[model samples]
Target chain A: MDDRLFRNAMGKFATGVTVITTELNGAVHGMTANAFMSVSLNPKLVLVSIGEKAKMLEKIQQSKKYAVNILSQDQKVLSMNFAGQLEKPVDVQFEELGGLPVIKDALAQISCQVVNEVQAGDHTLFIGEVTDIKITEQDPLLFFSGKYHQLAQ
Target chain B: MDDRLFRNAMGKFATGVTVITTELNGAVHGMTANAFMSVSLNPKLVLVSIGEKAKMLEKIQQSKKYAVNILSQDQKVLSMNFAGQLEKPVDVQFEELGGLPVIKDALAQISCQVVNEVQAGDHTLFIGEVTDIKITEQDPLLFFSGKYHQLAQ
Candidate 1:
């Protein structure tokens, strides 16, 4: 019943940072997220949760496609920019796949076609079928307790 | 579709390790998992995907209740032990809450009642309604590219 406790408790679970991106209507939009997962292997389904108020959420809904960019340890600044925390100029370079902009220099990129969308509370859960993917040998950037951290080597 | 490629690509997305625990028939059972997420907020739902072949799946199916222990960064050995990589000795100490064994030294502990189970491909996705939880000030242990990693300060 205590919402603060729940939020504090959930924050303890560390997660890799990612930027969910899409290009729609001649504009690029994205948001930093950690709520990404594979839902099915047979159809290569994946899902990402986006807050309903995020601009990226509307872009994804309108475009019906998006890319999941798994950030590398060195990409913390990129994640922060997408998360609207940094005021970087929006001149992001993207690789087009499934007609969506996959961010550059990520550890991996998954291009997905929207298969289903579920309205859950204040967030929209977008389920997509993975149509294409790319991977780079790089360390992943991580987020925990509201801060960016690199892997301990 | 190349399954290996998909797996390898996904492996790039690092995640924290966790143990899904449940008590059934006065016995304790648990398994390692990386596929966990917060699904909803209004009703407070969380989900964990388990391989059908995992013994913990059977226990969860029977008990309809489980707890998740988000391992701390220092608990790499504990994660391995619960994942069956290291021998699971009966001497391991586990705390109890909601009749489930909560792994000691976890960053967070969540006790949930199974709200729904969806059979998806080779995994059973269990959605749980959180009933109780505990949080600790500890960094989480992460898994990426088939290896354990700790956050760098």
Candidate 2:
């Protein structure tokens, strides 16, 4: 399999970065992700695919609730930190709302309650129904073709 | 509900355009989609959410086989035309292999056999096992915030 070509081809598609956060056992856990999408509007459903090995997956599974924090262009540092690319402690400061940890100053925040968990290969697809949400007027952080990009305008 | 706001908010996240094609009864049906995602690696699984009302849904249900054509930047016209936004006929030209339409000049084309179909809200999520794929080196077309954009560099 030509993994490089496959990844490069997939990378050509741009996506918005998001931090999926949840609170479990009085501790907050989060992970950087671009695999978030809205599934249904009538039920206000969304899904975020988390790697099976990710700690956040365990936390979300246990809590059955999570928040999707859509990052802004200025939150690259935050994205890296939560993604564990930065040498920071896991006990990072965070805001709690709807019983989930939310990154401050995000473009938008959607608190969700997991309705279903489906094992999909190496990832677990969490289908959640949005219970509460917050929005801000801000430019979103962009990930494109394996690089960070911004809006053309 | 604020449909425009919801549309605009969801549009902020850029995604690659995909044409989910399937052949049924010697006729090919396709749907323009942006909800394709890689679900797993070991089993080579992928997922695409199809609106229940789409004609391709019944075709996939009958055939149990579908192909995803990830469009290149140059194929935006094709995407728009297939999306039924243009005043053109719904006729699509493609290469038929394994009884599926293989779009021309796509960045990547994945042929899959449906493994599972789950009804989620107003859409049906088709989980397919990738049996074969082909790739090419090309920039992908992107849709975000309700606008079509391409790679900057």
Candidate 3:
């Protein structure tokens, strides 16, 4: 299939939005991503796919640590902020979990230690061993077909 | 973190459900999965995480080809059927794409050639190079916190 066709098909798969955060050289960086999933329960592993051109790629590689912040339905602005779609930076807050920084008030904050990295195509798959996690009850922000959605009911 | 705690945190990340299908010999097998994501766009790649004990794991390893059927919201029964959570079997249909078997009436069907398999924890990540795709207009089935949801308009 062609590129556009491939993308269109991929977009049909809905997913929750997440802000992948990592610290490097005393600075914190965030990137909005939907290409994240749980790999296993035995060793507690999760995955996040990062494009080669993304700034967070180098940040995670150098830091060897990251946090996956599953956003709440109320945190649309934060998603746009980290995704660079907002014209102005929104005031953001962070909390510490397992020595990693995570977005405060996120639906779930998962701190991870980089365990493996696999390169494929124009992206890298980072497999993280989850070290700690915190979860709050709330509806999660959803993304589908280039638009944001919320839970029906 | 404990296993249940880690699982709860992972469940917070919403995702669309998929039916992973592969053919071995003359029979086809399917497994319901949510651990699927688009890995890259340059070479058109996708990833699906399969547990070591899953029947689809060895099937994909042997066949080296699979199809991801992105389910529509109306296909909850199909999800339960393939997941082995149903008491009575529902009538299922199949179609062909790129020489792979795919669920009929799926929101999107993607046929892929297995490019790499990475072992992590108790699961294996199968990296696939997308060979062909078919997309139809329909709302996608969503899963969050162990429940099915729909897009809020």
Candidate 4:
């Protein structure tokens, strides 16, 4: 498909980079994805999109739990590590926050349980109910126009 | 549920602001939202979350079509206008692009037809299939940590 144009168009919509982590079979897996959004504020619902073929999708499906770690600007290395752009996976320092593995000192950490899943074209959109949340005052890492951008002062 | 902490947590995830618009019976309605995201690639899916009680939500459900107008770096007024934060309704400048009403000179515009929908807590998530898209070279307007930010040089 001639989707380069489509992808470029979508990329203009700047987004905060997030590392979605889920545990399965006593192991934790994290994937870098920018396709995340808040859904229902009342029920504290959020959603993240994972490629259908990504191993992380299977982890969430099996475990029914995932944590959304909103990366700070300084965590670019962590974002790239999970995005498979690193030569070797970096050792991510994760802490157990509310029974979920989360990036240490993230701007925000949201622990959730999957209440619903929707299979969209080439992706699985997991709708999670936020079980717990943590926040910080750190600046966030952003993705825009196909590159990582930091917040302007 | 007490969601002040959860809401504050999600706000740390920087996002490009969007004005989602739809038309019904020849009248167009738009709302400012940052709760929009890309869902898939192969079929080009995207989604925008609308609060359950919003008038904009009902319009989308009936029209089955909407346009995502990703704002430019200078369009904070438009964002605030649609967000109901303005004392007077600003006369929004709109242009029809590919059968959908959109803000002229937006960084990107995506017109979509509703493919799926879900009822989340206090909101409704509308999944859309992209029918048309346009991209420009303008920088995007970003929202982060409850404030508007421009791209850092």
lDDT of 3 at A77: 94
What's the DockQ of model 3? 0.91
Question: What's the C-alpha lDDT at position B71 in model 2?
Answer: 89
lDDT of model number 2: 0.79
Instruction: Write model 3 residue lDDT over A2-34, tens digit each, in one string.
Output: 788988889999999999999888888999999
Query: Per-model i-RMS in Å?
Result: 1.8, 2.2, 0.8, 1.3
Best by DockQ: 3
TM-score of chain A of each: 0.92, 0.94, 0.97, 0.97
Candidate 4 lands at a TM-score of 0.97
Query: What digit string (tens of lDDT, one per residue) describes model 2 on residues A1-153?
Result: 565655654565567899899988877778899888878777777888888888888888889999989898888888888788987644455786677788888888888999989888788899988777777777778886677876655
Model-by-model lDDT, in order?
A: 0.82, 0.79, 0.93, 0.89
Predicted candidate 3, C-alpha RMSD: 1.0
Give lDDT tens digits, candidate 4, residues B18-134. Answer: 999988999989999999888888888988989978999889999999999999998999999999999999888889866889998888899999999888788888999998888
TM-score of each: 0.89, 0.90, 0.98, 0.97
Write candidate 3's Cα lDDT for B1-153 as tens digits: 577888788889999999999999958889999999999999899999999998889999999999999999999999999999999878789989999999999999999999999999999999999998999989989998989889997
Candidate 2 versus truth, CA RMSD in Å, comes to 2.3
lDDT of 1 by residue, B21-70 (tens): 99887787878888888777777778888876889888998999999999
Give the poorly placed runs of model 4, Cα more than 4 Å off.
Answer: none
